[PDB]
Amino acid sequence: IRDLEASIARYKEEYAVLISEAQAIKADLAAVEAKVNRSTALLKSLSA
């Protein structure tokens, strides 16, 4: 049971690390969406 609890702790730490990386990717995705919207407005205006 102690080994199972240690594996539980390790697996939840890896889960937290994976969620951390996924949310960093999500923040980068939001920044990319903002950049895409700004660049599309810029593309329309400077195409005119």
């Binding site: 049971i1 199972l4 609890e5 594996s7 539980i8 697996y11 939840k12 889960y15």
Partner: peptide
């Protein structure tokens, strides 16, 4: 995690 929790509950 759920599988390990179920195994720990069983044993």
């Amino acid at each position: 995690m759920v599988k390990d929790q179920q195994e720990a509950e069983k044993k």
